[PDB]
Write a protein that binds this ligand. Structure first.
Ligand code: K
Ligand code: MG
Ligand code: MG
Ligand code: MG
Ligand code: MG
Ligand code: MG
Ligand code: MG
Ligand code: MG
Ligand code: MG
Ligand code: MG
Ligand code: MG
Ligand code: MG
Ligand code: MG
Ligand code: MG
Ligand code: MG
Ligand code: MG
Ligand code: MG
Ligand code: MG
Ligand code: MG
Ligand code: MG
Ligand code: MG
Ligand code: MG
Ligand code: MG
Ligand code: MG
Ligand code: MG
Ligand code: MG
Ligand code: MG
Ligand code: MG
Ligand code: MG
Ligand code: MG
Ligand code: MG
Ligand code: MG
Ligand code: MG
Ligand code: MG
Ligand code: MG
Ligand code: MG
Length: 72
RNA sequence: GGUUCUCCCCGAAAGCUAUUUAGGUAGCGCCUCGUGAACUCAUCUCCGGGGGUAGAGCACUGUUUCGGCAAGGGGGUCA
């Protein structure tokens, strides 16, 4: 084996999605994120457990129990 | 507002629900890729079903025009 002749296993490497590089790329102009809206914007997207202003599942359900000191 | 090379396969939605929500967002529904599974699924034929729509009708709910039957009544007449 030479330093050139080495090569990786097939399927190991996968290039990567490069957004905004023409029509032919596929993704390109709106880099796979649609037209307008909060999610299209830079630094967009809502925080975790946010259901559009509806009271979230992790708040409409009651909280229960106590963490045991002895179990630790 | 703009988001820069190329070819191959599949290919939506503009609905429901909720929202200080309504040009935003979230779960489901529809798109995709992956992994599993039964004759699963569609079509047609023949069965077993529940409708109470279209249409129709007037016993009931109401409405409606005649004719008949008139209880009930409106005007008159007395000592
Ligand atoms: K509908
Ligand atoms: Mg390779
Ligand atoms: Mg490649
Ligand atoms: Mg490289
Ligand atoms: Mg990288
Ligand atoms: Mg890039
Ligand atoms: Mg692509
Ligand atoms: Mg595209
Ligand atoms: Mg995307
Ligand atoms: Mg745009
Ligand atoms: Mg829009
Ligand atoms: Mg969007
Ligand atoms: Mg920014
Ligand atoms: Mg931000
Ligand atoms: Mg407590
Ligand atoms: Mg096609
Ligand atoms: Mg509800
Ligand atoms: Mg509603
Ligand atoms: Mg909306
Ligand atoms: Mg808005
Ligand atoms: Mg599939
Ligand atoms: Mg796996
Ligand atoms: Mg069968
Ligand atoms: Mg089944
Ligand atoms: Mg069948
Ligand atoms: Mg039959
Ligand atoms: Mg039958
Ligand atoms: Mg029947
Ligand atoms: Mg009818
Ligand atoms: Mg009718
Ligand atoms: Mg009859
Ligand atoms: Mg009759
Ligand atoms: Mg009735
Ligand atoms: Mg009545
Ligand atoms: Mg009548
Ligand atoms: Mg009459």
């Amino acid at each position: 084996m030479r330093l050139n002749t080495l090569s990786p296993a097939e399927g190991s490497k996968k290039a990567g999605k490069r957004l905004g590089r023409g029509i032919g790329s596929g993704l390109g102009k709106t880099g796979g994120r649609g037209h307008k809206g909060q999610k299209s914007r830079s630094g967009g997207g809502v925080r975790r457990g946010f259901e559009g202003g509806q009271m979230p599942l992790y708040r409409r359900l009651p909280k229960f129990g106590f963490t045991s000191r002895k179990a630790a």
